[PDB]
A paper describes a structure:
CAPs are multi-domain, multifunctional proteins that oligomerize into hexamers and promote rapid actin filament turnover in vitro and in cells. The C-terminal half of CAPs harbors two proline-rich regions, PP1 and PP2, which bind to profilin and SH3 domain proteins, respectively, and a Wiscott Aldrich Syndrome protein homology 2 (WH2) domain, which binds to both ADP-actin and ATP-actin monomers. The CARP domain of CAPs binds specifically to ADP-G-actin, and together with the adjacent WH2 domain catalyzes nucleotide exchange on actin monomers. Collectively, our study uncovers the molecular mechanism by which the WH2 and CARP domains of CAP associate with actin monomers and accelerate nucleotide exchange on ADP-actin.
To reveal the principles of CAP–actin interactions, we crystallized the CARP domain of mouse non-muscle isoform, CAP1 (CAP1317–474) in complex with unmodified muscle ADP-G-actin. Crystals diffracted anisotropically to 2.3 Å in the c direction, and to 3.2–3.3 Å in the a and b directions. The obtained crystal structure of a symmetric complex containing a dimer of the CARP domain bound to two ADP-actin monomers reveals several new and unexpected features. First, each actin monomer in the complex contacts each of the two subunits in the CARP homodimer, and each CARP monomer (within the homodimer) binds to two actin monomers using two distinct interfaces. This results in a sandwich-like structure, with the CARP homodimer squeezed between two ADP-actin molecules. All of these other proteins bind to the “front side” or the barbed end interface of actin between subdomains 1 and 3, whereas the CARP domain binds to the “back side” on subdomains 1, 2, and 3 of actin. The “primary interface” of the CARP domain on subdomains 1 and 3 of actin overlaps with the binding site of profilin on actin. However, the “secondary interface”, formed between the second CARP monomer and actin subdomain 2, is different from the interaction sites of other actin monomer-binding proteins characterized so far. In the crystal structure, the D-loop of actin subdomain 2 has a pulled-back conformation and associates with the secondary interface of the CARP domain. Our structure revealed that the C-terminal tail of the CARP domain forms a hydrogen bond between a backbone oxygen of CARP Ala473 and the imidazole ring of actin His73.
Author numbering:
A (entry chain A), B (entry chain A): 5 to 375
C (entry chain B), D (entry chain B): 317 to 473
Write the structure that this text describes.
Amino acid sequence: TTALVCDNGSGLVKAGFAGDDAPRAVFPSIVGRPRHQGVMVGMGQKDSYVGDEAQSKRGILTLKYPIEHGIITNWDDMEKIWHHTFYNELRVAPEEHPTLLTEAPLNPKANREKMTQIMFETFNVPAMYVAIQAVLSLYASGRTTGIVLDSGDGVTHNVPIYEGYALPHAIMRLDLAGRDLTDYLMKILTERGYSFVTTAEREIVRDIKEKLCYVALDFENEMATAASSSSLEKSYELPDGQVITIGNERFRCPETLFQPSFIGMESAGIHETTYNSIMKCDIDIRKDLYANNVMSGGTTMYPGIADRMQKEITALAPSTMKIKIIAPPERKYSVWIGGSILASLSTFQQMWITKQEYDEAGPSIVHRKCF
Amino acid sequence: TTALVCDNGSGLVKAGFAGDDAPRAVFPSIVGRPRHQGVMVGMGQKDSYVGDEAQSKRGILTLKYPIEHGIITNWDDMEKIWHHTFYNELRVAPEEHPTLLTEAPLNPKANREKMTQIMFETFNVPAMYVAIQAVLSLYASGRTTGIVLDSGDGVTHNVPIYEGYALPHAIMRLDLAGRDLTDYLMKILTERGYSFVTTAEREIVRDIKEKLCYVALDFENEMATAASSSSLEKSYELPDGQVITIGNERFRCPETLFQPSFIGMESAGIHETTYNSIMKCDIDIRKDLYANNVMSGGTTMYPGIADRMQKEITALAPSTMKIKIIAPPERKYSVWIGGSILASLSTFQQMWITKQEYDEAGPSIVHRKCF
Amino acid sequence: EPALLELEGKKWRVENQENVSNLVIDDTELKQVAYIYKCVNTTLQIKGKINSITVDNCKKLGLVFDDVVGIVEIINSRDVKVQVMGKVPTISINKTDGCHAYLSKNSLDCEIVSAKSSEMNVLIPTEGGDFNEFPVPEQFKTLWNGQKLVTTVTEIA
Amino acid sequence: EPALLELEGKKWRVENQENVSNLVIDDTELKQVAYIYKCVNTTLQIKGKINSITVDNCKKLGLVFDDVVGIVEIINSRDVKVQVMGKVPTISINKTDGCHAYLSKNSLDCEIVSAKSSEMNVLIPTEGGDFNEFPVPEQFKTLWNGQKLVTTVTEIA
Ligand SMILES: Nc1ncnc2c1ncn2[C@@H]1O[C@H](COP(=O)(O)OP(=O)(O)O)[C@@H](O)[C@H]1O
Ligand SMILES: Nc1ncnc2c1ncn2[C@@H]1O[C@H](COP(=O)(O)OP(=O)(O)O)[C@@H](O)[C@H]1O
Ligand SMILES: [Mg+2]
Ligand SMILES: [Mg+2]
């Protein structure tokens, strides 16, 4: 019986069928609502638009970003994202498919309980499950122990994991990710005299970033190479057919990940946050975390990112220590891929929380059954 | 049917019978336990000592102060204070008497719920009630509107009240009260060469404070009067029969209430905290709070305190404004006196929460029935 | 099962209401208080300035009020929408799940007290025909510093 | 009604125990986890270093453990006593009422996470044959500063 996997991302929702090589539906986790200002109490809630439809109608609608920082802050908005995922994106009846949900790191016990409630009560699902994001990414690399660096759209997490159980004291949140890099690329492209301002122009900047932006092994070596010759410079074609030539912007944009001072952030770099996190962990596990560094999500897709990570971690960690950065090409959807493999296993049908089980224990059953 | 009134104080528990002119039992809200350090999990909880018995055995016992700051932080300790109040101090069967409990200002909804639970489940009471401390003090002055300055043993509160309902944004906590003044009196008596250090010597300092300490109308006028002549100086007889002569210590000790900088506190004075609190309140109620200032608890028993309060408030408030400080001589037990009058009224038997009511709603019934 | 809205003494007894969108408390005095209990899927509007409001054990409740002297207390409830049109000094959200505090351009100094609660959002109005949503934290971090417990707010920003 | 203590895969199934003071998990490995569920008035002691511990829906529970790699999580419980003899990085107290975290002279850096909880006390040991008790805050104050919600801890000191 075809089970659904739903990764509720800070920027994008990834949904599809467990067993499939990649998510069938990938859309913005944005809910758009008509603008209201009077007596704000809902009689019988009118019209709403989700995803690309919401995002395009940006000007005329109040947009709600419920997963903005990884954790769901609004359930009516989340129910709209889920109802759009089921009926409109995946075009399936939730009542017929057991459903797996991804959860953010440092997610409240009440948050996982409400996920269960909505699934059973609001979507009439036959079964469901709550799995942690970083864990699913590690599970994709076959590993159950490692420090996952998950860089998505709105948030970046360092999540140390020992035997499939996250070490919450060492989880590091960095509120610098995909949307920030796209924003900086826009800021530094104004320098060359290129002006990207419309919601439609941002799409081009996101495209440039994803296509031409690389992580320099040595930033200063590259800044001098970019200053001496036009060797590193590259051309990009715009929708209208004009060609723009971008230079040092190529490596200065994902350098914000390592040097947050570029966007005015007091925060330490992704290399620093990784090291710091492994240092917070017990001396008895540090070796395994050093040797099993797993990269995940869109903002890790940059070329040269893993090479730099090796170089910066080798620098902070003791001389003797072995470091292995793992960047699977699937890493853009590795959370979803993990959950896909998990819901697929024949030795997982026991693991689901059934509505018969929910009818008895209620939403509190998530702590026991999803351990 | 004889109803009990129990004021759970930060320093002293005041208990007795509703209708009686004063509390029958007045003892320290201290629970003393034997010293333990191994596997700290209770199989079948051994021996415990409450009140004066605990306090005297200070050296050999770990003492627990559960009401230290007004709010109860430990229920096993509180059950020991209550069980000692019932069976040992008041010598009554809780199962036969409906019981009223006083509550601190800014008390958690869970705290009032647990009070109800313990009363019904742990003491088998026929009925009970939860009333706020400052409210009961105001109710004693016949008033239902005013700003109560409650200065007890461990905490000082400014509690504005409109029509018997406290304004929580304007409640001011000052963690400077009775025990602090006694401590300072000990510190400044070392100056004259008198050394009070034993738990037994502190009792003498508390006695001096309560007997010889007054609040100066003008501190500097009195500090110059004390410097010029020995007119303000007074003699005190110690248990052994020796006589000590105390000078300026008389007014310097309760001056800490107005000048907290005397004990190293960054906090603003009781006159300032009062004004500030009335200022936080709505412009539509300020006049009534200015004209109805009610003083309550032991640390307000000082002579001259009300006169000074008038003088300092007249100074901060507009020139036009009427200020009336109200200091009833009963103020040392006015919370208890209030609850006594309340549990006494024939038009209050409706107001109690009965065990029949508890058997249905549970501890959540306190919010509805005690509104 | 039972159902009533009435002024008992000085307090408004809005009790056991089940599916009513047009509920208004028109006559009002500073002195009076409101106690909304066991209301399921109902909308209520208090017009004028009153002493205080409490919402106990209410499911999918919606309360709009003008002005308050004291406090608005949401207790043991779920999915509650609360709005000020005027001024309110404090909003307390206690053992409730899902609470949306729509403030007013005067109630911008309003203190939102929270305890044993979740899905709390403070809605701040803009001059753009809507409100910007902001979540309230619900997880905390206490440390032993060497002399005292130090508690810090686990941010969502 | 049912009652069992057993190693299922890698996790300890301490479930449905009712009035047992002498309960010890002696054989232990870093890899293994513990899930104490529906235990009423029982005392348990885990000897050795393990991955993590969870306590779900337990009434008047008492847990003593040696060392932990991850976290100890107390969930939907009441009147729980938890103690470290060694090291523990985090103690999470979630939707529980009455929780006493007895720390150890190494676990002094232990982070006590709290959410929807009450009557929480952190017990710090002294060289005087006892522990000094310290309450955990349970009420919070959020403000609109003009750009963001500012949440501050409502102290008990
Ligand atoms: N090839 C790529 N190179 C660099 N960044 C990318 C690439 N593909 C996606 N991203 C960026 O990463 C983000 C999407 O990452 P994702 O892991 O799906 O986020 P989330 O789960 O937080 O919603 C977007 O900001 C996107 O522009
Ligand atoms: N006559 C007095 N003059 C000054 N202070 C007094 C007097 N009587 C009691 N106190 C002091 O006030 C405190 C008792 O006040 P109380 O209101 O009972 O406190 P609480 O309710 O916080 O337990 C003690 O510190 C005591 O020494
Ligand atoms: Mg993600
Ligand atoms: Mg008192």
